[PDB]
Amino acid sequence: AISFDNALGIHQHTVGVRERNAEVISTNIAQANTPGYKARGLDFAKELQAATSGDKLYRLPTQPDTGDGNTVDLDLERNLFMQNQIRHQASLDFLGSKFKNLTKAIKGE
């Protein structure tokens, strides 16, 4: 034992995935008005598995498009972006406390 992997856990890979998800969600919000653009989804479980050791998912629209072809539901995108930011803040707190505890033990302070 006594290794950074065994000490940090999955809180280092989770942060990267949460930032990846925010990039995907922000892309859907920006491309909301572009006709023909299809909303992009991200699988957290698969992304976390790939990050730990190392495809395109589309979001099914709740209602038909008005003709443009864009399936971005901006009501859902804001809700997911808000959730992603909260869980990302927790992951930083979880990962940040891993380093603080490691520093505390190696210095006894």
């Binding site: 901006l74 009501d75 804001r78 809700n79 972006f81 808000m82 930011q85």
Partner: protein
Amino acid sequence: TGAIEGSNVNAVGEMTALIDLQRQFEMQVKMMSTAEEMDKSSDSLLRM
């Protein structure tokens, strides 16, 4: 022969169509206004 045929426009029929087109037009305009009103409200979600 000796006569000219006029138009068959029913003036009342057009006028009653006009007043119904106005009201239906105005009701949909209110739908546009309440659509952006909902959109403005659902913007504090990302306002941390």
